[PDB]
Design a protein around this ligand. Sequence first.
Ligand code: K
Ligand code: K
Ligand code: K
Ligand code: MG
Ligand code: MG
Ligand code: MG
Ligand code: MG
Ligand code: MG
Ligand code: MG
Ligand code: MG
Ligand code: MG
Ligand code: MG
Ligand code: MG
Ligand code: MG
Ligand code: MG
Ligand code: MG
Ligand code: MG
Ligand code: MG
Ligand code: MG
Ligand code: NA
Ligand code: NA
Ligand code: ZN
Ligand code: ZN
Lengths: 76, 93, 88, 52, 136, 103, 225
Amino acid sequence: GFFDADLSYPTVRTERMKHKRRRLVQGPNSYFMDVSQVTVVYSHATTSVECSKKLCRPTGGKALLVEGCGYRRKPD
Amino acid sequence: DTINAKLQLVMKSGKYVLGTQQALTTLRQGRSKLVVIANNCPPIRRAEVEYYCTLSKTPIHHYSGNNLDLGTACGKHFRTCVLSVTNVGDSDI
Amino acid sequence: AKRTVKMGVMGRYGTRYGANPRKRAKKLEVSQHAKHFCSFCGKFAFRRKAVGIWRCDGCSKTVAGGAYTLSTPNNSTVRSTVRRLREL
Amino acid sequence: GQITEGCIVCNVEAKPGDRGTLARASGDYCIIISHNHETGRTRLKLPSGQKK
Amino acid sequence: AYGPNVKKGDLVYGVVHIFASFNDTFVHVTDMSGRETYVKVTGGMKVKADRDESSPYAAMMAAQDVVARCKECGINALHVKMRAVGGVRTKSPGPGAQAALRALARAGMKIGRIEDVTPIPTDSTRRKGSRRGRRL
Amino acid sequence: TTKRRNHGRSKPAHSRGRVKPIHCFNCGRLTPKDKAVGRFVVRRMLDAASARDVAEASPVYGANFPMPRLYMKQRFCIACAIHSRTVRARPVGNRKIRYTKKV
Amino acid sequence: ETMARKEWYDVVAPANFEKRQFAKTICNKTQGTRIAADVLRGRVFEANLADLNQSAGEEEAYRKVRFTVQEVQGRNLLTQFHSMEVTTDKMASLLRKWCTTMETTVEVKTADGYTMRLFVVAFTKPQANQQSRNCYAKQRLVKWLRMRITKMIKRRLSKVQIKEAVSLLTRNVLSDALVRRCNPILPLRELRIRKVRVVRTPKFDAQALLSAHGTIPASVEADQR
RNA sequence: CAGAGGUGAAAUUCUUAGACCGCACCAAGACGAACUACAGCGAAGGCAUUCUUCAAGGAUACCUUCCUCAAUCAAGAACCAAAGUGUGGAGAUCGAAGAUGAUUAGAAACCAUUGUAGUCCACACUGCAAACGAUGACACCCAUGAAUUGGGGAUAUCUU
Ligand SMILES: [K+]
Ligand SMILES: [K+]
Ligand SMILES: [K+]
Ligand SMILES: [Mg+2]
Ligand SMILES: [Mg+2]
Ligand SMILES: [Mg+2]
Ligand SMILES: [Mg+2]
Ligand SMILES: [Mg+2]
Ligand SMILES: [Mg+2]
Ligand SMILES: [Mg+2]
Ligand SMILES: [Mg+2]
Ligand SMILES: [Mg+2]
Ligand SMILES: [Mg+2]
Ligand SMILES: [Mg+2]
Ligand SMILES: [Mg+2]
Ligand SMILES: [Mg+2]
Ligand SMILES: [Mg+2]
Ligand SMILES: [Mg+2]
Ligand SMILES: [Mg+2]
Ligand code: NA
Ligand code: NA
Ligand SMILES: [Zn+2]
Ligand SMILES: [Zn+2]
């Protein structure tokens, strides 16, 4: 302890555990990836994405990537 | 159902004709692309329509409802036993 | 305007035959004069001619069933049972 | 002998070739109970509730 | 005179059904199919008062009467089946069940396998008494 | 004057509407299944004295092979549970003691 | 006197069991138009599996087998399998509180007729390092487990004769296969077949009965003392 | 083969015309034990066997869409345990009324043996409960420690 917690400047340890709509300023949780023709895939996709074959499977949470194609997270 | 979704696309974008007599006329010509028959159709009338489709090699779909359901699915307020679509627009089938 | 409060078609009997006997006969009287749905064709055009005999105005088809209604509830059960046994 | 057990029937012949004597009034029927292949007989429940 | 044609030391098995309620006790010996009975003695055949038909003493006397006569039959070993009233009534065995089984063992019979065969419903009809129970 | 916070059963306010009743093991009174006093008992068929008499006379039962037991799930109405000493009235301080396992 | 008119018989089991002549019984001797064979046919005898397969170990001591008389040959009664069941004390000692109990019913028909019903039961268990207060199962896994058991039993028992089917149940082979293939779906504490009953039988065949009994040990009940 | 049932103790009641008891079956109507828990679902009333089938409901996930569409209420409408009513079915169990034994000063009651209406199903009524958390609905803030049901995110154990 011994550290005073400022409400307007929370520590990274505290703020990292919060629900996305309980942060000081709310924001997204998802991101975009590219796979390899090369296509961009949403991290929480729920529809069917085609190359020539399906690349991901829908899930209750994050989408499931097929095995046998490299993927990389895009910035920003 | 999947068939009902396509009928709405045709009903607003394509061209069609309602009734057995007008559908047979399109089959005698070459303009027919698909024929839909309700399950509530007289057996002798159905056999005649299917024979025309076989001769002209036209795809045919057996609807799962009666002529009341087929008319409702087209947005109409009357019963239709046979439907023939001459033009399909922005639709797979 | 509405011409009677309670008894619609039984009003032809005046004050005679008693309230409960009139009430029980009204349900069957209404049913035997209504137009029932025809599975052949698609119209509400089934009318009873004689007891157990129904004719369609559109189809011009005659069907045998029911003293006061086109199909009895016991008949619906029997059709399902027969279809199930045939599919075995 | 060709009708599955548990079926609903009407116009039943009491004796072969009688051309129909049981379950003929309006709304009536008979119920098939069981078969006996050794004796070649069939058991029925009549509208009155009796078994034959 | 009676008994199966076996050597003098072989074991011949029967089955004894012991029914012990809170009003009586049955000691009943049958074959291994249950279709043939050898002897049957009840506690009520041994006492004179209605309130003693289920006492452990009456059950002890009934068992000894069973052994003293089934020895002529040639039966000298028994499998045991015990039951309470069961059904929708009580499932606890009556007082005479313990005494009857012990008496048979001390009388000379060999004891095979033991099992409880009380009737148990998977779901039941309503039992007697009201929704308030027996108010005694 | 409310005597118990749970009112003598196991039905919180916003959990259930009704629990089906059961017959008392002893008198037959109908009691909701979550209110009645339940016990699972395992009783030996014979006591120690009778068991040794039977065992010596058996070619089956002995040191290696034990003898069978009775298994029962008993549910009582409140009056029958008190009269049979299954539970007793307790001082006000001690009423909140609960046991989760057979002791 | 009753036993002045009784006669003794022997009950023999099919060839799948080591102990052939288990149990003895009595019946009235033939008098007038009443024939002893007519009364005897159709009786059901119950025995303990550990006594039949005396070479078996400890799990067989908790099962009982029933046989039904089909023919009388001298003083011997020839039998066929009727049912099998776990004893009541053993079954009631398997239930625990904070788990879930799963039951299935399977009905299958063997090659030579003989429809039968199976009645399986199973229980869940906690994992080795579990800390939770219960090990209840999800309903989707219970349904999946029930489906797999039904598929394996019907496939296995519909290709064999009645004699081999009994040997699979008696010698504890089918249950082990079920446990091995069902643990991946859901960790199981125990899986048992608790009751088998024959529901329907084919027409009587004398040669089929004889081929199932091998060599018949001779009874000495009718001889002189 | 001579008793069985029932009680604190008995008696009404059944039984050599074979009761009770024992084994395997058959019929019919209810009901789904143990697992069953300060657990789940439902607006409340309520809801526990398996398989097939129909239309729904909530929670979670989302860098999808839309843009104030909301909260709560006289009048008006729908649902609502048990008992009760009407017309058809059904009628195993239990059982208001009634009958017969006891107990008692008396006992119309509590106890015992029975038993009608009911108890179950379909359609139509009725609109009452200690219909209770005796606590109206929507919204905000609020200390601590162990748990539990469903979904999701991050990173040593068992089976396959
Ligand atoms: K008899
Ligand atoms: K979780
Ligand atoms: K969680
Ligand atoms: Mg008292
Ligand atoms: Mg809730
Ligand atoms: Mg309530
Ligand atoms: Mg309690
Ligand atoms: Mg859990
Ligand atoms: Mg008595
Ligand atoms: Mg259950
Ligand atoms: Mg009611
Ligand atoms: Mg009624
Ligand atoms: Mg009525
Ligand atoms: Mg009664
Ligand atoms: Mg009474
Ligand atoms: Mg008096
Ligand atoms: Mg309350
Ligand atoms: Mg109030
Ligand atoms: Mg949940
Ligand atoms: Na011993
Ligand atoms: Na009744
Ligand atoms: Zn018509
Ligand atoms: Zn009680």
